Amino acid sequence: EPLHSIISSTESVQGSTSKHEFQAETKKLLDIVARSLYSEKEVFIRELISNASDALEKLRHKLVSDGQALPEMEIHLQTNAEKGTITIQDTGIGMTQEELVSFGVGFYSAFMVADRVEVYSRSAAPGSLGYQWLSDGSGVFEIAEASGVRTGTKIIIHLKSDCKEFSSEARVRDVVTKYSNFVSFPLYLNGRRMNTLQAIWMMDPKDVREWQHEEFYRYVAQAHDKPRYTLHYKTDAPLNIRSIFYVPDMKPSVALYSRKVLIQTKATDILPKWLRFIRGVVDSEDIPSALIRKLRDVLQQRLIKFFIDQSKKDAEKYAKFFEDYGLFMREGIVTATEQEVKEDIAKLLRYESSALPSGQLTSLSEYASRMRAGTRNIYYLCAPNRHLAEHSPYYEAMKKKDTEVLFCFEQFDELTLLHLREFDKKKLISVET
Ligand SMILES: COc1c(C)cnc(Cn2ncc3c(Cl)nc(N)nc32)c1C
Numbered sequence: 001e002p003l004h005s006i007i008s009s010t011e012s013v014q015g016s017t018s019k020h021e022f023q024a025e026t027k028k029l030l031d032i033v034a035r036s037l038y039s040e041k042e043v044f045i046r047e048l049i050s051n052a053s054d055a056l057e058k059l060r061h062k063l064v065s066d067g068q069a070l071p072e073m074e075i076h077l078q079t080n081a082e083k084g085t086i087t088i089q090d091t092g093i094g095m096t097q098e099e100l101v102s103f104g105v106g107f108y109s110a111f112m113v114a115d116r117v118e119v120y121s122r123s124a125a126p127g128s129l130g131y132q133w134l135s136d137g138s139g140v141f142e143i144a145e146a147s148g149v150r151t152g153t154k155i156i157i158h159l160k161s162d163c164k165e166f167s168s169e170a171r172v173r174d175v176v177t178k179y180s181n182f183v184s185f186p187l188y189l190n191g192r193r194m195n196t197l198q199a200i201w202m203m204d205p206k207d208v209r210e211w212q213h214e215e216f217y218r219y220v221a222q223a224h225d226k227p228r229y230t231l232h233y234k235t236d237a238p239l240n241i242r243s244i245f246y247v248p249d250m251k252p253s254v255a256l257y258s259r260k261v262l263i264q265t266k267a268t269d270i271l272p273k274w275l276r277f278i279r280g281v282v283d284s285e286d287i288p289s290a291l292i293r294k295l296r297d298v299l300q301q302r303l304i305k306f307f308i309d310q311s312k313k314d315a316e317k318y319a320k321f322f323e324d325y326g327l328f329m330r331e332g333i334v335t336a337t338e339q340e341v342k343e344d345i346a347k348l349l350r351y352e353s354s355a356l357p358s359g360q361l362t363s364l365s366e367y368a369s370r371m372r373a374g375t376r377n378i379y380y381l382c383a384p385n386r387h388l389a390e391h392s393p394y395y396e397a398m399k400k401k402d403t404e405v406l407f408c409f410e411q412f413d414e415l416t417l418l419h420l421r422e423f424d425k426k427k428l429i430s431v432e433t
Contacts, residue, residue: 003191007078007089010148011120013132017142020101027139034111034137041113041163045172046179047106048088048155049075049187050261054103055092055153056185059124062093071151075187077176079169084159086166090185091152094123100133100143110155111137113163118156122149179262199260201244201281205232217246221279225249228321231306238298242283245303251324257283269293272300274332274345277325304344311348311363319361322350330416342420349416351380352407354395358386362406364423370404371426378428380417382408394432405431 022030038044052075063070071091078087100121110117119133130149135141157166165171169190176189182199197219200212217227229247245254253276256264260283269289270282284295311318322329332345350361355370367378379398383389389407398405408414417428 004188004193005076005078005191006072006074006091006150007076007087007154010150011130011132011146011154012148013144013146015144017132017134017144020141020143022139022141029105030108030111030137033105033108037105038109038112042166042175043179044109044112045077045086045088045166045175046261047109049077049176049180049183050259051103051106052088052090052092052153053184053260055090055094057092059091059093059152062124073185075183075185077172077187077189079167079172079190081164081167084161084164084167086157086159086172087155088157089150089152089154091150092124094125094128094152095121095131096123096125096128097131097143099123100131107155110157111135113159113166114157115160116158118158120146120149120154120156122151124151181262182257182260184260199257199283201232201242201257201283202260205234208232213244213246216244216281217248217279220255220281221246221248223248223250223279227279228317229306229310231303233299233302233306235298239294240285241295241298243299244280245306246279247277247321247325248279252277252327254278255281256287257281258285258287259283263287270295270299271303272296272332274328274335275300275303277328278303301344304348307348311350319350322348322361326350330412333416334419339422343423346420346423351413352386352409354390354398354405354407367404367406368424368426374403375425376427377403378406378423378426379403379431380406380408380414380428381431382411382414385409392432398431 056073056075060070060073074091076089080087114137117135120130121133122128122130130146132144132146133141159166173189173194176187176194180187181195181197183195184199186193187195198212200208200216213230214226218224226249227246228249231245233241233243233245235241253266253268254270255262256267256270269292271278282295282299307318310321329345329348333342336342336345346364350363352358352360353362356362364378371377381389381392381395383392386407389395395405408417421428
């Protein structure tokens, strides 16, 4: 029995509770978050845990800053069938009386599942008093000074009668592992440790190394191979982004987190569909799917840039990459409405050339460089193979021309090139006609 629990009845109230009413605002806010805010109730577990994390962080930040030693920082959950209750305690930083009397709105999600909510909290500030807070969700809550309150916050939820399911250990376990696996602080359920995965996307890219990226890749992609490509991308400049993107070793989606808290599974709009082969995670604080598209554009540009930069530091690895995933790139080009989205994506295309040795590939932009004068012509020919292409007469005029011609060997490459009628300021025309 390595049983580890901190949740116990140590709290007592000596005086009477003072009765308060929420302000005309908060009654609506509490009402709403219960009534319409969350699509499925279970997420209350998700919110409270998140709160429990934040508090803990704020404690750890304080102590470490003052050079003080660290106490046990933990999050504990307790289910009870006989009492029909679910409990969540964190020792983190607490709440002063002021804070209790008058993070966000996550807490109030608890009233999606509760007849009444009973809370005990203490601030980590020296010589702080503990307090009890009681609510029916009415508009009436109660505050009293409590004894036997541990530093941090203890929330006791008396589930309403159709929500006794969250009094079951198994159920709550499932919810926890679903949304809360990557919590930053040790999390216990009924005395047992329940979490172990590290939110490596939050780390400094220079601290994350291979074995970790490999583990995480296998987890998020549910795969047994390795990522051939890894992009660890962080920004505050446009929006808040902590992301990791993987390209699988094997030939043929992204999870949406916020603050290490699972928002969505198998999300389809974070990345453009032509990038649906990408695996990994995107974490952002700019979250509630009508307008998530800022992120989509930012990530599309960042990923295109990434691959373009991959083609330079390594030539043949990117050649195999284009061989195995060129499908999605052509598809993306033909799909995109605006022209230069087409062209951005077209910067990833690799084709053989009349100039280069048979077996080597070239991008379009490289093609722009070689041409001397005569802007407004890009020359291409599609044929069964390189040898066949070389013979063809129409090129022959080109061969004594001094102008390079690209070589395609599949109709989908030529169709792609025909759709993308123009690259940069130069037209893509076929040497025959
Ligand atoms: C019942 O009291 C409240 C009310 C009235 C509003 N919001 C919350 C959530 N909340 N707010 C601060 C805070 C801290 Cl420091 N730790 C933890 N775990 N939870 C927190 C509570 C607990």
